[PDB]
Amino acid sequence: APARVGLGITTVLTMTTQSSGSRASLPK
């Protein structure tokens, strides 16, 4: 699998937390 893509999407997902609690859309 594409490491750059995985890292990138993971980074983006990490950054776009929205909930403001370290995790993204994982409020649990």
Curated annotation (Swiss-Prot):
Record's subcellular location: Postsynaptic cell membrane; Synapse; Perikaryon; Cell projection, Dendrite
Transmembrane segments: 2-22
Annotated site (Important for obstruction of the ion pore in the closed conformation): 13
Result of altering residue 28 to E: In HKPX1; requires much higher glycine levels for channel activation
UniProt domain comment: The channel pore is formed by pentameric assembly of the second transmembrane domain from all five subunits. In the absence of the extracellular domain, the channel is in a constitutively open conformation. Channel opening is effected by an outward rotation of the transmembrane domains that increases the diameter of the pore.
Additional detail: The alpha subunit binds strychnine.
Family: Belongs to the ligand-gated ion channel (TC 1.A.9) family. Glycine receptor (TC 1.A.9.3) subfamily. GLRA1 sub-subfamily.
Disease note: Hyperekplexia 1: A neurologic disorder characterized by muscular rigidity of central nervous system origin, particularly in the neonatal period, and by an exaggerated startle response to unexpected acoustic or tactile stimuli.
Subunit structure: Interacts with GLRB to form heteropentameric channels; this is probably the predominant form in vivo. Heteropentamer composed of four GLRA1 subunits and one GLRB subunit. Heteropentamer composed of two GLRA1 and three GLRB. Heteropentamer composed of three GLRA1 and two GLRB. Homopentamer (in vitro). Both homopentamers and heteropentamers form functional ion channels, but their characteristics are subtly different.
Functional summary from the UniProt entry: Subunit of heteromeric glycine-gated chloride channels. Plays an important role in the down-regulation of neuronal excitability. Contributes to the generation of inhibitory postsynaptic currents. Channel activity is potentiated by ethanol. Potentiation of channel activity by intoxicating levels of ethanol contribute to the sedative effects of ethanol.
Protein name: Glycine receptor subunit alpha-1
Natural source organism: Homo sapiens
Gene: GLRA1
